[PDB]
Design a protein around this ligand. Structure first.
Ligand SMILES: O=c1ccn([C@@H]2O[C@H](COP(=O)(O)OP(=O)(O)O[C@H]3O[C@H](CO)[C@@H](O)[C@H](O)[C@H]3O)[C@@H](O)[C@H]2O)c(=O)[nH]1
Ligand SMILES: O=c1ccn([C@@H]2O[C@H](COP(=O)(O)OP(=O)(O)O[C@H]3O[C@H](CO)[C@@H](O)[C@H](O)[C@H]3O)[C@@H](O)[C@H]2O)c(=O)[nH]1
Ligand SMILES: [Mn+2]
Ligand SMILES: [Mn+2]
Lengths: 282, 282
């Protein structure tokens, strides 16, 4: 009942049916990871059985981990790609947005699926459930998940109310910041990639501004648990989500970083520099 | 070390000294309340000993309570003023901003102090600590508190990061949404009053835009505990805080209310209608 293809229930397709509908299209899965040694294995394990079938490629984009993320992920059979390796001609910047952007150059799938590597016990139907609308539907180029400490505080207090205020047509997207989603390569390599934690909200809005809702679907993945960061780390994330949201809506951002008083004072980085469409690097 | 008079430590003044420095100025205290039967008595009790001394007036602005807020507050010796009684010629709208605005017409103090009526065990030096800079300093017309479930989520994830983005000069205010603050009547009756939960962020920004930081002081009240609302109630608050913040910064707000999916759907009210400076009602 939303102006937006929303699969509220457990999708009916089977792996064999979904695989049939590929029709020569390839599927790449990317797990971005920064210091996720405790959950990375269970996430890979939940997806690796699809490889050489529904999924043609799985990588861990290691965003500079200093723990045992890489050795654990290799031991799980995964190809692990550093940011450097993904695109060596261009120096590495920090943040998640950098990692997803770069992952576009280390993959070749007509469809790209992103799964966060800190999920606690991810269901192995996550990927099949996300490529569903891209395969069977028409016009769909972006599929966002929804679900459910916690509650998605930055989602419920910042991104959703801000979308209500500045892009109300996106008010029917239930989890605009979700790290689990899939999209066509043609769309992904045509859009710029916001830095740090701005990347999701930036892709959602440029996708909308460029193609309208009809290109966007969302799908219930059920329940979703992950690391629940402390409030001060979220402030920093929220600051970046805000900077990216305002820019896509034509509003000048001060570029000034959030300062916190814990009393002691800390100033977190924010970035106004988007990475350009990966096309320009061909 | 901030561009903003910040009393980081327990203020040194005594009640007698502060009272001396009034110099013919009167002090009104206002407790806005909506259904606070469980905490209203302890809050009044913590302040009533100042009446006919440092404080010349105390009221409870009852914002339509359906519990025993009024009878309990009366039994504590407080004058209780309904919104209707505060300003009968003008029909009542909902929200906190309505209540504070109206309270300006039911008081006569040259200085007005606001204290939330849901505080758990408020220190009885709260009021003395807030009128300090208005009495002894010069130029000061607004005094904001700071302190400390929870953590002030809407504060740390929405108001502070948004001020960083759009009014970075206000980045050194530690609790811009705090319900405990004092201000001169001349300032208060000259500013418009945002609706619902937008009122604080609206007063902070119009005060800044109109007088600069030099008119603003903040004071440590130590620790502060209150009702910790559920996340969905905060989304609604956050939506209003956002609508008010964007308007003061010259940015058009859609006027569209936040919708939530709990799955079931609910749409909370937001308002773009500010009450005008109480001066215009003279
Ligand atoms: O510099 C970084 C930071 C994070 N990550 C990875 O990105 C994923 C998500 O990061 P996380 O710290 O867990 O973000 P969340 O607190 O869970 O934030 C949620 O909301 C954010 C705002 O859009 C999204 O970026 C996240 O994917 C989403 O889970 C994890 O696998 C991290 O390893 C990186 O690769 N590089
Ligand atoms: O329609 C209303 C709503 C609330 N209140 C009173 O206002 C005070 C604060 O309301 P509360 O629901 O406790 O807000 P908080 O969740 O604590 O929000 C914090 O941040 C808000 C955003 O600025 C401020 O409005 C609050 O004062 C501040 O405590 C309480 O005494 C309420 O009784 C009313 O009088 N009328
Ligand atoms: Mn996470
Ligand atoms: Mn409260």
């Amino acid at each position: 009942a939303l102006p937006l293809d929303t699969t509220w229930h457990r999708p009916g397709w089977t792996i064999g049916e979904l695989e049939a509908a590929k029709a020569g299209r390839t599927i790449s899965v990317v797990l971005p990871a920064l210091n996720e040694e405790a959950t990375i294995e269970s996430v890979i394990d939940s997806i690796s059985p699809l490889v050489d079938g529904l999924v043609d490629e799985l990588i861990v984009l290691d965003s500079g981990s200093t723990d045992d993320t890489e050795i654990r992920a290799i031991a799980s059979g995964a190809r692990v790609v550093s940011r450097e390796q993904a695109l060596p001609e261009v120096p590495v910047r920090p943040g998640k947005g950098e990692a997803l952007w770069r992952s576009l150059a280390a993959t070749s799938g007509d469809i790209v699926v992103f799964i966060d590597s800190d999920l606690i016990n991810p269901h192995p139907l996550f990927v099949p459930w996300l490529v569903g609308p891209l395969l069977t539907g028409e016009g769909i180029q972006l599929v966002k998940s929804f679900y459910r400490t916690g509650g998605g505080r930055v989602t419920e207090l910042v991104a959703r109310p801000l979308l209500a205020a500045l892009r109300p047509e996106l008010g029917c997207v239930l989890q605009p910041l979700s790290g689990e989603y899939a999209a066509s390569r043609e769309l992904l390599t045509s859009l710029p990639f916001a830095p740090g934690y701005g990347v999701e909200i930036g892709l959602l809005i440029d996708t909308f501004d460029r193609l309208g809702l009809d290109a966007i679907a969302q799908v219930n993945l059920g329940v979703r648990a992950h690391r629940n960061r402390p409030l001060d780390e979220l402030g920093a994330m929220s600051r970046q989500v805000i900077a990216t949201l305002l820019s896509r809506c034509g509003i000048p951002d001060s570029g000034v970083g959030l300062t916190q008083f814990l009393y002691t004072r800390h100033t977190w980085p924010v970035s106004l520099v988007d990475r350009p469409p990966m096309k320009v690097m061909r």
